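Design a sequence for this backbone.
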């Protein structure tokens, strides 16, 4: 689909509320005459650089903020310059996540953090620790159930455990990330992934489990727990599993530390519709009504808009989200995050499969990330 003056094309990931977003687009069109088309292509975060230059891309792109520094480095993102009245409507820490080399490069939408989701009927008192999960699984196995299933194919979901005892991406000191100081093969990182691989070795998890398999198992009442973000809650509502949302398990006494993402809306620097895009985002999406439409489709998490978040904060699933966020850390947005995620993806998949030892998988990932910085 070709970008065109007088229409808006929006890209957002397939696990988000694109139908709720399309409803906001319908209100925009009712007021302005401007058609808004929402798409959720596969690997949209990887396709965006090419199509921006060829003309086949979106006016507006949604992703977690960690991807946006690499986009800005390549010139792909229009600078965002809201008036103070609008800026004041969103939490300052969300604007911080979309600031890159002194410019705002997107609008923040909502704060995402993984939580432990658990079946209250199978497991009224979920474990506080990772160490408790093997024996819990053993008991559940004798009932033809399992303790825990989550996506092992995306490193996003395993990172809270790796980080718990000391793993980190890039060392952060005095407001700057030291791209030479990577923490993916330190003792903390090794201990977390070793624990995960030992679960697999002892048949308390399966190396092959992905997003679909874990969501299906939890929503069919086959596993007592999953790890996932707020977007998953609506499919769980539909299944009417009785579920809670709670703090992630500790490891070696330390909290799991999920990498926190700010879902953000960037404007294609080459869009012929930059003003319309700002008009849509500031006056239609980032309002109580616009976010509620999306949120009702797939829950956004802790939205960046203060007025609406004051309502959402009363939901215990949102408070659990923010507690896990506070124990974790905001992702960097620096361009090196792409290589970080690719290298750690390989390391988790190879360690979990037994293709490599934990120590060699993380050492190779550490080396790749460092040499590429
Ligand atoms: O697994 C590496 C990717 O992790 C995050 O992607 C998250 C994203 O924040 C969340 O909204 C989405 O729905 O789940 C994915 C994991 O599949 C980073 O935002 C990505 O840049 C990383 O590639
Ligand atoms: Cl610009
Ligand atoms: Cl417990």
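Sequence:
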């Amino acid at each position: 689909m070709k970008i065109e003056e007088g229409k808006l094309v929006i890209w957002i990931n397939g696990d988000k509320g694109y139908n709720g977003l399309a409803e906001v687009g319908k209100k925009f069109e009712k007021d302005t005459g401007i058609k808004v088309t929402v798409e959720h292509p596969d690997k949209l975060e990887e396709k965006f650089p090419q199509v921006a230059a060829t003309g086949d891309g979106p006016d507006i792109i949604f992703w977690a903020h960690d991807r946006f520094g690499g986009y800005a480095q390549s010139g792909l993102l229009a600078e965002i310059t809201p008036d103070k009245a609008f800026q004041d409507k969103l939490y300052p820490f969300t604007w911080d996540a979309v600031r890159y080399n002194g410019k705002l490069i997107a609008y923040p939408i909502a704060v995402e953090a993984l939580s432990l989701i658990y079946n209250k009927d199978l497991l009224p008192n979920p474990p506080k620790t990772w160490e408790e999960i093997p024996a819990l699984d053993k008991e559940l196995k004798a009932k033809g159930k399992s303790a825990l299933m989550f996506n092992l194919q995306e490193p996003y979901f395993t990172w809270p455990l790796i980080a718990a005892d000391g793993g980190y991406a890039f060392k952060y000191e005095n407001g700057k990330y030291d791209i030479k100081d990577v923490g993916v093969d330190n003792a903390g990182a090794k201990a977390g992934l070793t624990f995960l691989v030992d679960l697999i070795k002892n048949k308390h998890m399966n190396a092959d489990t992905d997003y679909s398999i874990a969501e299906a198992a939890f929503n069919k009442g086959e596993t007592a727990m999953t790890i996932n973000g707020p977007w998953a809650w609506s499919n769980i509502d539909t299944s009417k599993v009785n579920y809670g949302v709670t703090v992630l398990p500790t490891f070696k006494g330390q909290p799991s530390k999920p990498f926190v993402g700010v879902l953000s809306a960037g404007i294609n620097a080459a869009s012929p519709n930059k003003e319309l895009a700002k008009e849509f985002l500031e006056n239609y999406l980032l309002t109580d009504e616009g976010l509620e439409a999306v949120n009702k489709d797939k829950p956004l998490g802790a939205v960046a808009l203060k007025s609406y978040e004051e309502e959402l904060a009363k939901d215990p699933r949102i408070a659990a989200t923010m507690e896990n966020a506070q124990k974790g850390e905001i992702m960097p947005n620096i361009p090196q995050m792409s290589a970080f995620w690719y290298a750690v993806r390989t390391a988790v998949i190879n360690a979990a499969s037994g293709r490599q030892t934990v120590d060699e998988a993380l050492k190779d990932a550490q080396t790749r990330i460092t040499k590429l910085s």
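The chain has 16 helices and 15 strands.
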